[PDB]
């Protein structure tokens, strides 16, 4: 499986509401991107799926860390800014 094929696997998982498997696939993609492998998939795309999926597993702190990374690499990302605000709000409540 190429990086892009792993991405398509994770996207397929996500589209079915299987967030646990989305995380596994997207962590594999992100590992390969961060190791410098070439693909058409971008780190921003992977982080967008990965952050949301992690939050669905119940992990706010990790979802926030991933969203901050996403925003660092993609400041005009529509949803990442709104998500960051939402997650930061949840963090103040705990």
């Amino acid at each position: 499986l190429s990086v892009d094929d792993c991405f398509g696997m994770g996207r397929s998982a996500y589209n079915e509401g299987d967030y646990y498997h989305t995380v596994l696939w997207m962590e594999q993609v992100l590992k390969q991107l961060d190791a410098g492998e070439e693909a058409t998939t971008t780190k921003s795309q992977v982080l967008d799926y990965l952050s949301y999926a992690v939050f669905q597993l119940g992990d706010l702190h990790r979802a926030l860390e991933l969203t901050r990374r996403l925003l660092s690499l993609d400041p005009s990302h529509e949803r990442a800014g709104g998500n960051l605000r939402y997650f930061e709000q949840l963090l103040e409540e705990e």
Partner: peptide, 7 residues
């Protein structure tokens, strides 16, 4: 909740 990717 957060907004995730469309598709």
């Amino acid at each position: 909740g957060p907004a995730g990717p469309p598709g």
